[PDB]
């Protein structure tokens, strides 16, 4: 299409990045383009598989102690499967948890079992493979309407993939599951965007705004919950207010935190898998060709490889409950430990040809949904289906859809985000 992005050779390894150029506790490092980032993690995996880092500043948050970065696959996996040692309390981002933040962000993702499991059971039936298989009809026609409207909205055949499809599809689905009405979708989207875009001047850099948005979304969850308290609807919000996770009902804060976890995770995750997928297809059109020629035959492995490639969630943090030594590095009880999924997903000792984007890759033990165990992504089956249906609807309405500019990238250490990706089609 000649308006298109330049092609790229598949299996191209990243630039050489000297260790002296790697500074994970600087925001400027997260600004560097993706190739240099991948290069920097390659250097770490080889020369400092476990290394220590001061935690990033950014206004209004509390950096506190630094963290031991696990950049190897086997260590990320080991840490995920040993939660007695690598605890999710008190926080799964690198910054210290505060009681003010805990009002909105003290959900089960920052708790250990047995309380974590008891909370998780409240909503987990809805995310089961049997059940996500049953909402294919809702997914399909949100996706189909979005691709149609992408076409109708754009006589020029020039659109932003992010706001026209990748963004609103996983948003509409999670809000529908929560029971959030249509008129509120956009406001919800703008809130989770600021929550998980903090540090990026296109999203927010003033902590006052972050606190306001948090309060607004917490206030919003509370009002919806209270509604559902009196009038059951058959949405996840009703399950939340009806639950006893205990022999006790959930507190306001527990409801607010659970609501915000679902909606943020639902809104700031699969949209990036989808946008990175389209970009990757734009760079490697042989891959686009193979998949379009055999959509259903290649879909299971295509969807996993888009997730491996995008690694939408860059890292999660844990905290040691006891001393432990790994790979010859002694770490102490109370130390922060960060699990770099984006690095595990390029690990030369687990993946042949880690730099090759291969929609037929089989097996594909990636850690895009984390390393397995107690906090395994609750939305994994939902996300896979969202991804599959989105590309299915593109393949059938605009099969040659293709990026026309490099993406505007989210400045973020936690989320491999794309803010906008101009695409074209014929």
Q: From the annotation, which residues make up the binding site?
A: 377
Least distance CB 6 / ligand HEM (angstroms): 26
Q: Which does 315 bind (CB under 5 to 8 A by kind): ligand VGJ, Ca ion, ligand HEM, none?
A: none
Q: Count of alpha carbons within 13 Å of 409, Cβ hemisphere only?
A: 18
Structure tokens at 140: 């399909």
Q: For 47, how many CA atoms within 13 A lie in the half-sphere containing its CB?
A: 12
243 Cβ partners below 8 Å, 6+ apart?
122, 249, 250
CA 6 to chain CA centroid, nearest Å? 27
Shortest distance (Å) from residue 274 CB to ligand HEM:
8
Distance (Å, rounded) from C-alpha 106 to C-alpha 115?
12
Nearer to ligand HEM, 42 or 261 (CB): 261
Q: Is 401 in the site for ligand HEM (CB under 6 A)?
A: no
- In angstroms, give the least distance from the CB of 162 to ligand VGJ: 17
Q: Is 312 in the site for ligand HEM (CB under 6 A)?
A: yes
Q: Tell me the C-alpha distance between 232 and 226, whole Å.
A: 10
Candidates 262, 280, 281, 344; binder of ligand HEM (CB under 6 A) is: 262
CB of 166 to Ca ion, least distance (A): 16
Q: What are phi and psi of 409, to 5 degrees?
A: -95, 140
CA atoms within 13 A on the CB side of 263: 32
Decide: is 236 part of the binding site for ligand HEM (CB under 6 A). no
* Cα–Cα distance for residue pair 405/423, rounded to 1 Å: 8
Binder of ligand HEM out of 39, 106, 168, 170 (CB under 6 A): 170
Selection from Ca ion, ligand VGJ, ligand HEM, none that 95 binds (CB < 5 to 8 A by kind) is: ligand VGJ
Cβ of residue 270: shortest distance to ligand HEM, in angstroms? Answer: 4
Give the footprint of ligand VGJ on this chain (CB under 6 A): 55-56, 58, 61, 93-95, 101, 105, 195, 198, 260-261, 264-265, 268-269, 313, 413-414
Residues 15-34 contacting ligand HEM, CB under 6 A: none
Closest C-alpha to 101, from 92, 249, 337, 316: 92
- Residues comprising the chain, all counted: 426
Kindly state the DSSP code that residue 355 receives in the 8-state scheme: T
Least distance (Å) from ligand VGJ to the CB of residue 420?
A: 20
Are the beta carbons of 348 and 354 closer than 8 angstroms? Answer: yes
Residue selected from 2, 130, 156, 296 as contacting Ca ion according to rule CB under 5 A: 156
Candidate list 91, 237, 270, 319; residue touching ligand HEM; CB under 6 A: 270
Neighbours of 361 (CB within 10 A): 18
- For residue 316, state whether it binds ligand HEM (rule: CB under 6 A): yes
Residue 2 has which token pair?
């000649």
Q: 411, exposed or middle or buried, with CB in 10 Å at 0-12, 13-18, 19+? A: buried
Q: Which residue is nearest to ligand VGJ (CB)?
A: 95
Shortest distance (Å) from residue 376 CB to ligand HEM: 6
156 touches, from Ca ion, ligand HEM, ligand VGJ, none (C-beta below 5 to 8 Å by class): Ca ion
261 binds ligand HEM (CB under 6 A): yes
Q: Is 307 in the site for ligand HEM (CB under 6 A)?
A: yes
Helix (H, G, I), strand (E, B) or coil at 220: helix
426 binds Ca ion (CB under 5 A): no
Rounded CA separation 128/119 (Å)? 16
- Measure the N-to-C terminal CA separation of the chain; round to a whole number of Å: 8
Footprint of ligand HEM on this chain (CB under 6 A)? 80, 108-109, 120, 170, 174, 261-262, 265-266, 269-270, 273, 307, 312-313, 316, 341, 368-371, 373, 375-379, 382-383
């Amino acid at each position: 299409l000649n308006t298109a992005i330049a092609t790229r050779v598949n299996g191209t390894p990243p630039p050489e990045v000297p260790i002296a150029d790697i500074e994970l506790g600087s925001l400027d490092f997260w600004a560097l383009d993706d190739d240099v980032r991948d290069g920097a993690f390659a250097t770490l995996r080889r020369e400092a598989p476990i290394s220590f880092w001061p935690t990033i500043e950014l206004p209004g948050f509390v950096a506190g102690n630094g963290h031991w970065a696990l950049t190897k696959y086997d260590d990320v996996f080991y840490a995920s499967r040993h939660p007695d040692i690598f605890s999710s309390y008190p926080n799964i981002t690198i910054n210290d948890q505060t009681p003010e933040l805990a009002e909105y962000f003290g959900s089960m993702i920052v708790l250990d079992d047995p309380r974590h499991q008891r909370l998780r059971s409240i909503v987990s039936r809805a995310f089961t493979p049997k059940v996500v298989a049953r909402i294919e009809a809702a997914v399909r026609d949100r996706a189909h309407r979005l691709v149609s409207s992408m076409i109708a909205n754009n006589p020029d055949r020039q659109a932003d993939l992010v706001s026209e499809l990748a963004g609103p599809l996983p948003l509409q689905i999670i809000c529908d599951m929560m029971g959030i009405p249509k008129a509120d979708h956009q406001r919800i989207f703008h809130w989770t965007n600021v929550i998980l875009g903090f540090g990026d001047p296109d999203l927010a850099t003033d902590f006052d705004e972050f606190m306001q948005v948090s309060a607004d979304i917490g206030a919003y969850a509370t009002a919806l919950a209270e509604d559902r308290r009196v009038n059951h609807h058959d949405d996840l919000t009703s399950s939340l207010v009806e639950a006893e996770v205990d022999g006790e009902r959930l507190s306001s804060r527990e409801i607010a935190s659970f609501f915000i976890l679902l909606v943020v995770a639902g809104n700031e995750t699969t949209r990036n898998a989808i946008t990175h997928g389209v970009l990757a297809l734009s760079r490697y059109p042989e891959q686009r060709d193979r998949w379009w020629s055999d959509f259903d035959g290649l879909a299971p492995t295509a969807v996993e490889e888009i997730v491996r490639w995008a690694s939408p969630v860059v890292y999660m943090r844990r905290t040691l409950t006891q001393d432990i030594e790994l790979r010859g590095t002694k770490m102490a009880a109370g130390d922060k430990v960060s699990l770099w999924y984006c690095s595990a997903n390029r690990d030369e000792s687990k993946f042949a040809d880690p730099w090759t984007f291969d929609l037929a890759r089989n097996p594909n033990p990636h850690l895009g949904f984390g390393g397995g165990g107690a906090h395994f992504c609750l939305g994994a089956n939902l996300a896979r289906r969202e991804i599959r249906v989105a590309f299915d609807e593109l393949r059938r309405q605009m099969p040659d859809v293709v990026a026309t500019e490099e993406p505007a990238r989210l400045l973020s250490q936690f989320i491999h985000g794309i803010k906008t990706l101009p695409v074209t089609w014929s």
